[PDB]
Specification:
The structure is cut from a larger assembly and holds chains A (about 80 residues) and B (about 70 residues). Chain A is about 70% helix and about 0% strand. The longest helix of chain A has about 35 residues, at about 40-75. The radius of gyration of chain A is 26 Å and the shape is rod-shaped. Chain A is built from 3 helices and no strands. In chain B, about 35% of the residues lie in helices and about 30% in strands. In chain B, a hairpin with a 5-residue loop joins β1 (about 5-15) and β2. Classes of the chains: A mainly alpha (about 80), B alpha+beta (about 70). The interface between A and B is medium-sized, with 22 and 23 residues.
């Protein structure tokens, strides 16, 4: 998770480490990119399922409120 | 020495770990006087090599501190 978020300094450290490991091959370097960081499926599905429960039980609260209108209409 | 654009997508992680897809648009150009050195150190195709590193790293950096 922090490999995602703190990727700024993760990339900085990886840059330093590869610069120190790669200076031995008679080549000169200027810049290096770390672009992507992905995970298989479950993180996004779980996030969206949590939002599913959030808005779905908001819908349940509105079913509940129509049940209130029911109390009275049916009174 | 004319100008040239670039774009960089990033699957960054917002503070709450929401993996947010965010793309950044970045322009550039090479300085006239120091075109010699920019060519010694990289070559003819200098920009393609350098453009996206800083951008992706910094989209991650910024969005990590900021919520979805």
């Amino acid at each position: 998770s922090q490999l995602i978020t703190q990727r700024a300094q993760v990339s900085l450290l990886i840059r330093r480490e590869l610069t120190e490991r790669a200076k031995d091959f008679s080549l000169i370097l200027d810049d290096v990119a770390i672009t992507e960081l992905s995970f298989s499926r479950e993180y996004t599905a779980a996030v969206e399922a949590k939002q599913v429960a959030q808005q779905e039980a908001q819908r349940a609260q509105f079913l509940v409120e129509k049940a209130k209108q029911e109390q009275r209409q049916k009174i | 020495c004319r100008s040239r654009p670039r774009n960089v997508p990033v699957i960054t992680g917002s503070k709450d770990l929401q993996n947010v897809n965010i793309t950044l648009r970045i322009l550039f150009r090479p300085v006239a006087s120091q075109l010699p050195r920019i060519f010694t150190s990289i070559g003819e195709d200098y920009d393609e090599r350098v453009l996206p590193s800083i951008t992706t790293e910094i989209l991650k950096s910024v969005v990590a501190r900021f919520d979805a």
